[PDB]
Design an enzyme around this catalytic site. Sequence first.
Site, mmCIF file in Angstrom:
data_model
loop_
_atom_site.group_PDB
_atom_site.id
_atom_site.type_symbol
_atom_site.label_atom_id
_atom_site.label_comp_id
_atom_site.label_asym_id
_atom_site.label_seq_id
_atom_site.Cartn_x
_atom_site.Cartn_y
_atom_site.Cartn_z
ATOM 1 N N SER A 60 0.872 -1.210 0.689
ATOM 2 C CA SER A 60 -0.061 -0.388 -0.193
ATOM 3 C C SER A 60 0.664 1.316 0.112
ATOM 4 O O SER A 60 -0.032 2.265 -0.462
ATOM 5 C CB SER A 60 -0.947 0.076 1.186
ATOM 6 O OG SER A 60 -2.177 -1.121 1.069
ATOM 7 N N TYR A 157 -10.390 3.261 6.507
ATOM 8 C CA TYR A 157 -9.392 2.323 5.402
ATOM 9 C C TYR A 157 -9.747 2.360 4.641
ATOM 10 O O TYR A 157 -10.446 1.162 4.904
ATOM 11 C CB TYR A 157 -8.367 2.580 5.793
ATOM 12 C CG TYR A 157 -7.129 1.877 4.814
ATOM 13 C CD1 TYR A 157 -5.871 2.841 4.727
ATOM 14 C CD2 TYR A 157 -6.566 0.811 4.778
ATOM 15 C CE1 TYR A 157 -4.636 2.600 3.816
ATOM 16 C CE2 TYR A 157 -5.532 0.778 3.423
ATOM 17 C CZ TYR A 157 -4.363 1.618 2.925
ATOM 18 O OH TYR A 157 -3.514 1.442 2.459
ATOM 19 N N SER A 158 -9.663 1.598 2.700
ATOM 20 C CA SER A 158 -10.514 0.891 2.196
ATOM 21 C C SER A 158 -9.557 1.074 0.747
ATOM 22 O O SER A 158 -9.375 2.320 0.756
ATOM 23 C CB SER A 158 -12.074 1.560 1.907
ATOM 24 O OG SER A 158 -12.625 0.534 0.667
ATOM 25 N N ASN A 159 -9.304 0.234 0.484
ATOM 26 C CA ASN A 159 -8.736 -0.173 -0.786
ATOM 27 C C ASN A 159 -9.293 0.186 -1.930
ATOM 28 O O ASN A 159 -8.773 0.318 -2.672
ATOM 29 C CB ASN A 159 -8.600 -1.725 -0.975
ATOM 30 C CG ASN A 159 -6.911 -2.020 -0.303
ATOM 31 O OD1 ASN A 159 -5.165 -1.753 -0.180
ATOM 32 N ND2 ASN A 159 -6.910 -3.232 0.371
ATOM 33 N N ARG A 283 0.611 8.828 5.104
ATOM 34 C CA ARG A 283 0.172 8.997 6.691
ATOM 35 C C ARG A 283 1.097 10.131 7.007
ATOM 36 O O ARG A 283 2.351 10.392 6.047
ATOM 37 C CB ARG A 283 0.392 7.461 6.833
ATOM 38 C CG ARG A 283 0.023 6.252 6.191
ATOM 39 C CD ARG A 283 -0.206 5.276 6.932
ATOM 40 N NE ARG A 283 -0.941 4.409 6.672
ATOM 41 C CZ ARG A 283 -1.977 3.606 6.951
ATOM 42 N NH1 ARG A 283 -2.995 5.134 7.633
ATOM 43 N NH2 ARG A 283 -3.040 2.899 6.351
ATOM 44 N N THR A 297 3.009 2.611 4.981
ATOM 45 C CA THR A 297 3.529 1.493 5.153
ATOM 46 C C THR A 297 2.671 0.683 4.236
ATOM 47 O O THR A 297 1.549 0.807 3.318
ATOM 48 C CB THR A 297 2.376 1.429 6.876
ATOM 49 O OG1 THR A 297 0.867 1.523 6.377
ATOM 50 C CG2 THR A 297 3.292 1.503 7.564
ATOM 51 N N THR A 299 1.420 -3.927 3.953
ATOM 52 C CA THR A 299 1.303 -5.358 4.563
ATOM 53 C C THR A 299 0.991 -6.323 3.438
ATOM 54 O O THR A 299 0.088 -7.594 3.336
ATOM 55 C CB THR A 299 -0.296 -4.932 4.500
ATOM 56 O OG1 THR A 299 -0.881 -5.270 4.581
ATOM 57 C CG2 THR A 299 0.386 -4.249 6.436
ATOM 58 N N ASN A 325 0.291 -11.168 8.010
ATOM 59 C CA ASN A 325 -0.001 -11.311 8.790
ATOM 60 C C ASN A 325 0.539 -12.182 10.184
ATOM 61 O O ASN A 325 0.275 -12.688 10.732
ATOM 62 C CB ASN A 325 -1.004 -12.746 8.223
ATOM 63 C CG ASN A 325 -2.401 -13.238 8.493
ATOM 64 O OD1 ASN A 325 -3.291 -11.810 9.606
ATOM 65 N ND2 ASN A 325 -2.337 -14.291 9.092
HETATM 66 P P1 LIG Z 1 -1.626 -2.485 1.794
HETATM 67 O O1 LIG Z 1 -2.873 -3.771 1.522
HETATM 68 O O2 LIG Z 1 0.175 -2.931 1.932
HETATM 69 O O3 LIG Z 1 -1.968 -1.845 3.399
HETATM 70 C C1 LIG Z 1 -3.254 -1.729 3.981
HETATM 71 C C2 LIG Z 1 -2.465 -0.764 5.598
HETATM 72 C C3 LIG Z 1 -1.493 0.414 5.202
HETATM 73 O O4 LIG Z 1 -1.833 1.288 4.259
HETATM 74 O O5 LIG Z 1 -0.914 -0.185 6.215
HETATM 75 C C4 LIG Z 1 -4.024 -1.034 6.224
HETATM 76 C C5 LIG Z 1 -3.960 -0.012 6.901
HETATM 77 C C6 LIG Z 1 -5.379 0.278 8.248
HETATM 78 C C7 LIG Z 1 -6.042 -0.625 8.076
HETATM 79 C C8 LIG Z 1 -6.024 -1.873 7.182
HETATM 80 C C9 LIG Z 1 -5.576 -1.322 5.835
#
Ligand SMILES: *P(=O)(=O)O/[C]=C(\C(=O)[O-])C1=[C][C]=[C][C]=[C]1
Length: 345
Positions: A60, A157-159, A283, A297, A299, A325
Amino acid sequence: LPAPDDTGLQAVLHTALSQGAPGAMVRVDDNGTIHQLSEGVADRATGRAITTTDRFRVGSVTKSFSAVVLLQLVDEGKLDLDASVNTYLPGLLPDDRITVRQVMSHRSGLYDYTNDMFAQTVPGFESVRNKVFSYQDLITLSLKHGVTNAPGAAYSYSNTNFVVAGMLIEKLTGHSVATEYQNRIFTPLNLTDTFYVHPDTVIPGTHANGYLTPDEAGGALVDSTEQTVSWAQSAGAVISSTQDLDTFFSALMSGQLMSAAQLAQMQQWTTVNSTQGYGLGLRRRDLSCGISVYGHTGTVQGYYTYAFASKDGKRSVTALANTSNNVNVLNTMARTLESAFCGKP
Ligand SMILES: *P(=O)(=O)O/[C]=C(\C(=O)[O-])C1=[C][C]=[C][C]=[C]1
Protein backbone atom coordinates in the site's frame (compact mmCIF):
# COMPACT_ATOMS: atom_id res chain seq x y z
CA LEU A 1 17.45 15.57 14.29
CA PRO A 2 18.93 13.22 16.78
CA ALA A 3 21.49 10.75 15.42
CA PRO A 4 19.92 7.51 14.17
CA ASP A 5 20.49 4.69 16.70
CA ASP A 6 21.94 1.66 14.92
CA THR A 7 22.10 -0.44 18.10
CA GLY A 8 18.40 0.20 18.51
CA LEU A 9 17.75 -0.67 14.87
CA GLN A 10 19.74 -3.92 15.29
CA ALA A 11 17.57 -4.83 18.33
CA VAL A 12 14.38 -4.13 16.38
CA LEU A 13 15.35 -6.48 13.56
CA HIS A 14 16.43 -9.16 15.98
CA THR A 15 13.14 -8.90 17.81
CA ALA A 16 11.23 -9.17 14.51
CA LEU A 17 13.05 -12.40 13.70
CA SER A 18 12.22 -13.73 17.18
CA GLN A 19 8.55 -13.06 16.42
CA GLY A 20 8.48 -14.90 13.10
CA ALA A 21 9.95 -12.71 10.35
CA PRO A 22 12.39 -14.82 8.28
CA GLY A 23 14.27 -11.61 7.47
CA ALA A 24 14.09 -7.96 8.38
CA MET A 25 16.01 -4.92 7.19
CA VAL A 26 16.21 -1.16 7.25
CA ARG A 27 18.00 1.62 5.40
CA VAL A 28 18.21 5.21 6.58
CA ASP A 29 19.31 8.06 4.32
CA ASP A 30 20.42 10.66 6.88
CA ASN A 31 21.13 13.78 4.85
CA GLY A 32 23.68 11.98 2.70
CA THR A 33 24.97 9.46 5.25
CA ILE A 34 23.59 5.93 4.87
CA HIS A 35 22.65 3.51 7.62
CA GLN A 36 21.87 -0.07 6.55
CA LEU A 37 21.13 -3.18 8.60
CA SER A 38 19.63 -6.58 7.84
CA GLU A 39 19.14 -9.85 9.70
CA GLY A 40 17.93 -13.24 8.55
CA VAL A 41 16.94 -14.67 5.23
CA ALA A 42 15.43 -13.59 1.95
CA ASP A 43 14.61 -17.22 1.15
CA ARG A 44 13.99 -19.45 4.16
CA ALA A 45 14.20 -22.71 2.20
CA THR A 46 17.54 -21.94 0.57
CA GLY A 47 18.89 -19.89 3.43
CA ARG A 48 19.94 -16.95 1.19
CA ALA A 49 20.51 -13.92 3.41
CA ILE A 50 18.32 -10.85 3.15
CA THR A 51 20.00 -7.59 2.27
CA THR A 52 18.96 -3.95 1.94
CA THR A 53 19.35 -4.12 -1.85
CA ASP A 54 16.74 -6.88 -2.24
CA ARG A 55 13.65 -5.83 -4.19
CA PHE A 56 10.29 -6.40 -2.57
CA ARG A 57 6.54 -5.71 -2.87
CA VAL A 58 5.82 -2.36 -1.20
CA GLY A 59 2.09 -2.97 -0.94
CA SER A 60 0.00 0.00 0.00
CA VAL A 61 2.95 2.35 -0.29
CA THR A 62 1.65 2.28 -3.84
CA LYS A 63 -1.15 4.60 -2.71
CA SER A 64 1.41 7.41 -2.35
CA PHE A 65 2.57 6.84 -5.97
CA SER A 66 -1.06 6.95 -7.14
CA ALA A 67 -1.67 10.13 -5.15
CA VAL A 68 1.37 11.85 -6.66
CA VAL A 69 0.11 11.10 -10.17
CA LEU A 70 -3.39 12.45 -9.33
CA LEU A 71 -1.96 15.60 -7.73
CA GLN A 72 0.15 16.26 -10.81
CA LEU A 73 -3.08 15.97 -12.82
CA VAL A 74 -4.57 18.60 -10.51
CA ASP A 75 -1.58 20.81 -11.23
CA GLU A 76 -2.10 20.34 -14.96
CA GLY A 77 -5.83 21.35 -14.73
CA LYS A 78 -7.15 17.87 -15.53
CA LEU A 79 -8.63 17.03 -12.16
CA ASP A 80 -10.45 18.94 -9.37
CA LEU A 81 -10.15 17.40 -5.90
CA ASP A 82 -13.60 18.70 -4.86
CA ALA A 83 -15.50 17.39 -7.86
CA SER A 84 -17.63 14.25 -7.67
CA VAL A 85 -15.88 11.02 -8.69
CA ASN A 86 -18.93 10.34 -10.85
CA THR A 87 -18.27 13.59 -12.74
CA TYR A 88 -15.24 11.83 -14.28
CA LEU A 89 -16.44 8.20 -14.08
CA PRO A 90 -20.17 8.44 -14.68
CA GLY A 91 -22.33 5.97 -12.80
CA LEU A 92 -19.38 4.46 -10.98
CA LEU A 93 -20.22 5.11 -7.34
CA PRO A 94 -23.56 4.77 -5.52
CA ASP A 95 -23.45 8.39 -4.31
CA ASP A 96 -22.69 11.30 -6.59
CA ARG A 97 -21.61 13.33 -3.54
CA ILE A 98 -18.43 11.25 -3.06
CA THR A 99 -15.53 13.45 -4.16
CA VAL A 100 -12.00 12.83 -5.35
CA ARG A 101 -10.56 14.39 -2.15
CA GLN A 102 -12.72 12.08 -0.05
CA VAL A 103 -11.53 8.95 -1.88
CA MET A 104 -7.88 9.99 -1.58
CA SER A 105 -8.20 10.55 2.18
CA HIS A 106 -10.29 7.44 2.95
CA ARG A 107 -13.36 9.56 3.81
CA SER A 108 -15.61 8.22 1.04
CA GLY A 109 -17.44 5.50 3.01
CA LEU A 110 -16.70 2.96 0.26
CA TYR A 111 -16.67 -0.59 1.68
CA ASP A 112 -13.25 -2.22 1.43
CA TYR A 113 -13.66 -5.24 -0.96
CA THR A 114 -10.64 -6.84 0.67
CA ASN A 115 -12.94 -7.41 3.70
CA ASP A 116 -14.54 -10.21 1.61
CA MET A 117 -11.20 -11.50 0.20
CA PHE A 118 -8.86 -11.94 3.16
CA ALA A 119 -10.83 -12.64 6.24
CA GLN A 120 -9.19 -16.07 6.01
CA THR A 121 -5.63 -15.10 5.19
CA VAL A 122 -4.11 -18.06 3.41
CA PRO A 123 -7.33 -19.24 1.62
CA GLY A 124 -7.89 -15.66 0.49
CA PHE A 125 -4.36 -15.44 -0.86
CA GLU A 126 -4.81 -18.72 -2.73
CA SER A 127 -8.05 -17.35 -4.19
CA VAL A 128 -6.65 -14.09 -5.58
CA ARG A 129 -2.98 -14.72 -6.21
CA ASN A 130 -3.37 -15.92 -9.83
CA LYS A 131 -6.44 -13.87 -10.76
CA VAL A 132 -6.57 -10.87 -13.04
CA PHE A 133 -9.24 -8.34 -12.10
CA SER A 134 -10.35 -5.26 -13.98
CA TYR A 135 -10.67 -2.05 -11.99
CA GLN A 136 -14.44 -2.28 -12.44
CA ASP A 137 -14.49 -5.84 -11.06
CA LEU A 138 -13.04 -4.55 -7.78
CA ILE A 139 -15.45 -1.63 -7.62
CA THR A 140 -18.37 -4.01 -8.18
CA LEU A 141 -17.18 -6.16 -5.32
CA SER A 142 -17.17 -3.16 -2.99
CA LEU A 143 -20.63 -2.07 -4.16
CA LYS A 144 -22.13 -5.42 -3.05
CA HIS A 145 -22.06 -3.60 0.31
CA GLY A 146 -23.45 -0.27 1.37
CA VAL A 147 -21.18 2.60 2.26
CA THR A 148 -20.04 2.71 5.89
CA ASN A 149 -20.41 6.46 6.46
CA ALA A 150 -21.66 9.61 4.74
CA PRO A 151 -19.36 11.24 2.15
CA GLY A 152 -16.39 12.91 3.85
CA ALA A 153 -17.70 12.13 7.32
CA ALA A 154 -15.33 9.57 8.76
CA TYR A 155 -11.93 8.06 8.14
CA SER A 156 -12.13 4.41 7.13
CA TYR A 157 -9.21 2.94 5.27
CA SER A 158 -10.38 1.24 2.09
CA ASN A 159 -8.52 -0.19 -0.89
CA THR A 160 -11.57 0.61 -2.96
CA ASN A 161 -10.53 4.26 -2.79
CA PHE A 162 -7.24 3.63 -4.55
CA VAL A 163 -8.92 1.38 -7.14
CA VAL A 164 -10.95 4.50 -7.92
CA ALA A 165 -7.63 6.40 -8.06
CA GLY A 166 -6.28 4.10 -10.73
CA MET A 167 -9.45 4.39 -12.79
CA LEU A 168 -9.24 8.17 -12.60
CA ILE A 169 -5.64 8.13 -13.74
CA GLU A 170 -6.30 5.86 -16.68
CA LYS A 171 -9.54 7.66 -17.69
CA LEU A 172 -8.17 11.19 -17.59
CA THR A 173 -4.79 10.42 -19.20
CA GLY A 174 -5.69 7.72 -21.69
CA HIS A 175 -2.60 5.80 -20.47
CA SER A 176 -2.03 2.89 -18.15
CA VAL A 177 -1.06 3.46 -14.53
CA ALA A 178 2.29 1.75 -15.32
CA THR A 179 3.02 4.35 -17.99
CA GLU A 180 2.04 7.22 -15.69
CA TYR A 181 4.14 5.92 -12.80
CA GLN A 182 7.09 5.39 -15.13
CA ASN A 183 6.94 8.80 -16.81
CA ARG A 184 5.97 10.92 -13.81
CA ILE A 185 7.91 9.23 -10.99
CA PHE A 186 10.20 6.29 -11.80
CA THR A 187 12.12 7.85 -14.70
CA PRO A 188 12.46 11.45 -13.28
CA LEU A 189 13.74 10.12 -9.95
CA ASN A 190 15.87 7.37 -11.54
CA LEU A 191 14.18 4.65 -9.46
CA THR A 192 16.13 1.75 -11.03
CA ASP A 193 14.72 -0.82 -8.58
CA THR A 194 11.08 0.29 -8.96
CA PHE A 195 8.52 -1.44 -11.16
CA TYR A 196 4.82 -1.85 -11.86
CA VAL A 197 4.52 -5.11 -13.79
CA HIS A 198 0.88 -6.09 -13.13
CA PRO A 199 -0.32 -8.73 -13.82
CA ASP A 200 3.13 -10.35 -14.06
CA THR A 201 3.95 -12.46 -11.03
CA VAL A 202 7.74 -12.35 -11.31
CA ILE A 203 9.74 -9.87 -9.24
CA PRO A 204 12.57 -8.67 -11.50
CA GLY A 205 16.13 -9.14 -10.18
CA THR A 206 17.29 -10.22 -6.79
CA HIS A 207 14.46 -10.04 -4.29
CA ALA A 208 13.27 -11.04 -0.88
CA ASN A 209 10.75 -13.81 -0.92
CA GLY A 210 7.55 -13.09 0.99
CA TYR A 211 6.18 -15.46 3.64
CA LEU A 212 2.56 -15.29 4.63
CA THR A 213 1.89 -16.21 8.25
CA PRO A 214 -1.20 -18.38 8.53
CA ASP A 215 -4.06 -17.41 10.79
CA GLU A 216 -3.47 -20.52 12.96
CA ALA A 217 -0.89 -19.99 15.67
CA GLY A 218 2.28 -21.96 15.01
CA GLY A 219 1.25 -22.82 11.39
CA ALA A 220 3.78 -23.32 8.62
CA LEU A 221 4.65 -20.31 6.50
CA VAL A 222 3.41 -19.99 2.92
CA ASP A 223 5.65 -18.58 0.17
CA SER A 224 3.60 -15.66 -1.20
CA THR A 225 6.30 -14.07 -3.37
CA GLU A 226 4.80 -14.56 -6.83
CA GLN A 227 1.30 -13.22 -7.37
CA THR A 228 -0.42 -10.85 -9.75
CA VAL A 229 -1.35 -8.35 -7.03
CA SER A 230 -4.33 -7.73 -9.34
CA TRP A 231 -6.54 -7.47 -6.26
CA ALA A 232 -4.72 -4.19 -5.43
CA GLN A 233 -3.23 -2.63 -8.61
CA SER A 234 -3.02 1.17 -8.01
CA ALA A 235 -3.77 0.43 -4.30
CA GLY A 236 -0.80 -1.93 -3.80
CA ALA A 237 1.20 -3.48 -6.73
CA VAL A 238 4.50 -1.44 -6.92
CA ILE A 239 7.81 -3.27 -6.50
CA SER A 240 10.75 -1.28 -5.10
CA SER A 241 13.77 -1.19 -2.86
CA THR A 242 14.73 0.60 0.37
CA GLN A 243 16.95 3.02 -1.55
CA ASP A 244 14.22 3.89 -4.01
CA LEU A 245 11.47 4.40 -1.44
CA ASP A 246 13.88 6.66 0.48
CA THR A 247 14.52 8.62 -2.70
CA PHE A 248 10.77 8.84 -3.46
CA PHE A 249 9.63 10.08 -0.06
CA SER A 250 12.56 12.51 0.20
CA ALA A 251 11.65 13.93 -3.18
CA LEU A 252 7.98 14.18 -2.20
CA MET A 253 8.56 15.97 1.10
CA SER A 254 11.26 18.27 -0.30
CA GLY A 255 8.89 19.57 -2.91
CA GLN A 256 10.08 17.92 -6.10
CA LEU A 257 6.97 16.01 -7.28
CA MET A 258 4.17 18.60 -7.49
CA SER A 259 3.39 22.22 -6.84
CA ALA A 260 3.59 23.63 -3.31
CA ALA A 261 -0.24 24.08 -3.40
CA GLN A 262 -0.80 20.40 -4.12
CA LEU A 263 1.70 19.21 -1.53
CA ALA A 264 -0.20 21.31 1.00
CA GLN A 265 -3.43 19.56 0.02
CA MET A 266 -1.67 16.21 0.35
CA GLN A 267 -0.70 17.11 3.94
CA GLN A 268 -4.17 18.22 5.17
CA TRP A 269 -4.48 15.61 7.89
CA THR A 270 -7.57 13.56 8.64
CA THR A 271 -7.30 12.01 12.13
CA VAL A 272 -6.63 8.29 12.15
CA ASN A 273 -5.89 7.94 15.86
CA SER A 274 -4.24 10.06 18.52
CA THR A 275 -0.75 9.62 16.96
CA GLN A 276 -1.56 9.38 13.28
CA GLY A 277 -3.10 11.23 10.40
CA TYR A 278 -3.93 10.52 6.77
CA GLY A 279 -3.59 13.18 4.05
CA LEU A 280 -4.09 12.35 0.36
CA GLY A 281 -2.48 8.94 -0.07
CA LEU A 282 0.01 9.85 2.71
CA ARG A 283 0.36 8.92 6.38
CA ARG A 284 1.63 11.00 9.29
CA ARG A 285 3.06 9.17 12.34
CA ASP A 286 3.83 11.09 15.52
CA LEU A 287 6.86 9.57 17.29
CA SER A 288 7.57 9.48 20.97
CA CYS A 289 10.13 12.22 21.03
CA GLY A 290 7.86 14.87 19.42
CA ILE A 291 8.91 14.29 15.80
CA SER A 292 6.31 13.59 13.07
CA VAL A 293 7.25 11.61 9.97
CA TYR A 294 5.44 11.20 6.67
CA GLY A 295 5.08 8.29 4.25
CA HIS A 296 3.17 5.05 4.06
CA THR A 297 2.97 1.42 5.18
CA GLY A 298 2.47 -1.75 3.21
CA THR A 299 1.13 -5.22 4.15
CA VAL A 300 0.79 -7.10 0.87
CA GLN A 301 1.08 -10.84 1.40
CA GLY A 302 4.43 -11.72 2.84
CA TYR A 303 5.86 -8.15 3.09
CA TYR A 304 5.51 -5.55 5.83
CA THR A 305 6.87 -2.15 4.77
CA TYR A 306 7.39 1.17 6.56
CA ALA A 307 8.67 4.07 4.38
CA PHE A 308 8.73 7.49 6.08
CA ALA A 309 10.64 10.78 5.80
CA SER A 310 11.03 13.90 7.85
CA LYS A 311 9.05 16.98 6.95
CA ASP A 312 11.85 18.46 4.82
CA GLY A 313 12.78 15.11 3.24
CA LYS A 314 16.32 15.22 4.57
CA ARG A 315 16.07 11.98 6.53
CA SER A 316 14.21 9.00 5.10
CA VAL A 317 13.78 5.45 6.41
CA THR A 318 12.50 2.28 4.78
CA ALA A 319 12.10 -0.96 6.74
CA LEU A 320 10.95 -4.32 5.45
CA ALA A 321 10.15 -7.62 7.12
CA ASN A 322 9.38 -10.49 4.72
CA THR A 323 6.35 -11.76 6.49
CA SER A 324 2.81 -10.45 6.89
CA ASN A 325 -0.26 -11.37 8.96
CA ASN A 326 1.87 -11.18 12.09
CA VAL A 327 0.97 -8.15 14.16
CA ASN A 328 3.88 -8.77 16.58
CA VAL A 329 6.25 -8.27 13.65
CA LEU A 330 4.27 -5.36 12.31
CA ASN A 331 4.34 -3.52 15.63
CA THR A 332 7.97 -4.30 16.22
CA MET A 333 9.00 -3.01 12.79
CA ALA A 334 7.33 0.35 13.54
CA ARG A 335 10.02 0.80 16.19
CA THR A 336 12.57 1.33 13.36
CA LEU A 337 11.07 4.82 13.00
CA GLU A 338 11.72 5.53 16.68
CA SER A 339 15.34 4.41 16.48
CA ALA A 340 16.00 6.10 13.16
CA PHE A 341 14.43 9.48 13.93
CA CYS A 342 14.36 9.74 17.75
CA GLY A 343 17.70 8.04 18.28
CA LYS A 344 19.04 6.71 21.56
CA PRO A 345 16.74 7.36 24.52
P1 LIG B 1 -1.72 -2.48 1.86
O1 LIG B 1 -2.88 -3.40 1.55
O2 LIG B 1 -0.33 -3.00 1.65
O3 LIG B 1 -1.66 -2.03 3.42
C1 LIG B 1 -2.78 -2.03 4.17
C2 LIG B 1 -2.81 -1.09 5.17
C3 LIG B 1 -1.76 -0.06 5.19
O4 LIG B 1 -1.77 0.89 4.44
O5 LIG B 1 -0.82 -0.23 6.05
C4 LIG B 1 -4.01 -0.99 5.98
C5 LIG B 1 -4.18 0.14 6.79
C6 LIG B 1 -5.25 0.38 7.61
C7 LIG B 1 -6.24 -0.55 7.66
C8 LIG B 1 -6.12 -1.66 6.89
C9 LIG B 1 -5.06 -1.93 6.06
